[PDB]
Structure 1
Amino acid sequence: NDMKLAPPTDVRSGYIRMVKNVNYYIDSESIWVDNQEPQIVHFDAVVNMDRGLYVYPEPKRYARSVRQYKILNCANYHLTQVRTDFYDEFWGQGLRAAPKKQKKHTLSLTPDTTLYNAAQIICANYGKAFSV
């Protein structure tokens, strides 16, 4: 209490920063385009946080960041949250802790949100070679 964090303002290489959330990044190495349907793209989002989350078995230990596995369908902008892991270092690495069960859901993305601008960037470089 309150265990606040000052998240890094220097962007680690390979990480693509979002406009709306300056602590929300796409991990560039993790991007995988689907072989069967090229419009489907899998990627990790990484969030460096404001406040340590004590999610670990040992409660002296707090996560500095989240790594979330996402699946994006560039045709309809449906975004599936697959998975979430907690890391004790920034940039989704370090000692890992995951929730007891994974909450999974698919959203239909709308304009003017962080996830939707993420999609715009992904689908313009990954699904296809350009935007429209």
Structure 2
Amino acid sequence: AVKLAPPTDVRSGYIRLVKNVNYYIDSESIWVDNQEPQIVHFDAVVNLDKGLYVYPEPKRYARSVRQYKILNCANYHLTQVRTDFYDEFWGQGLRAAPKKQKKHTLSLTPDTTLYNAAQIICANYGK
């Protein structure tokens, strides 16, 4: 069925992770906590290798996923706050969201797409 081709060219302001080339940090989404700068909020944006049909209309499918994250660089805890699906790449276009958002905080372990992102974030702001 669906069988799609995420952009090779990086749209300005998006930071590609080495361990998943379709996984990005939206630079413009980044906020470092004013009171505790070890904590930084940001959007993770994933260009999909498969259309996710999460829209009311049958052959409308999501091309990307935008996830609100909160990272504590002190302990590498990553909190998943919300998820939105978009029918274009780079987390734009028509949005669809699940009805209740699953939130979850994960203690990150080494050598995984998320740890990658943490290392970039904390490297930039953790010092």
* TM-score normalised per structure 1: 0.93
| CA displacement, residues 97-132 of structure 1 (integer Å, 9 cap, x when unaligned) | 00121111000001111111111110111232xxxx
Aligned counterparts of 1:74 and 1:26: Cα–Cα separation in 2: 16
Aligned counterparts of 1:97 and 1:24: Cα–Cα separation in 2: 19
Aligned counterparts of 1:93 and 1:117: Cα–Cα separation in 2: 24
Provide the secondary structure at the position in 1 that maps to 2:21.
Answer: coil
Aligned counterparts of 2:126 and 2:56: Cα–Cα separation in 1: 40
Aligned counterparts of 1:103 and 1:59: Cα–Cα separation in 2: 24
- Partner in structure 1 of residue 64 of structure 2: 65
Aligned counterparts of 2:67 and 2:106: Cα–Cα separation in 1: 15
C-alpha displacement of 1:60: 2.2
For structure 1, the 5+ residue unaligned runs are none
Q: Say how many residue pairs are matched.
A: 126
Question: 1:33–1:127: 8 Å Cα contact kept in structure 2?
Answer: no
Aligned counterparts of 1:44 and 1:4: Cα–Cα separation in 2: 25
C-alpha displacement of 1:55: 0.4
Aligned counterparts of 1:77 and 1:15: Cα–Cα separation in 2: 21
Q: CA RMSD in A?
A: 0.8
Aligned counterparts of 2:66 and 2:82: Cα–Cα separation in 1: 8
- Partner in structure 1 of residue 21 of structure 2: 22
For structure 2, the 5+ residue unaligned runs are none
Question: 1:40–1:127: 8 Å Cα contact kept in structure 2?
Answer: no
Q: Report runs of 4+ in structure 1 exceeding 6 Å deviation.
A: none
Question: 1:88–1:96: 8 Å Cα contact kept in structure 2?
Answer: yes
Aligned counterparts of 2:126 and 2:34: Cα–Cα separation in 1: 11
| CA displacement, residues 57-104 of structure 1 (integer Å, 9 cap, x when unaligned) | 112210000000000000000000000000000000000000121111
Aligned counterparts of 1:42 and 1:113: Cα–Cα separation in 2: 19
Aligned counterparts of 1:88 and 1:4: Cα–Cα separation in 2: 15
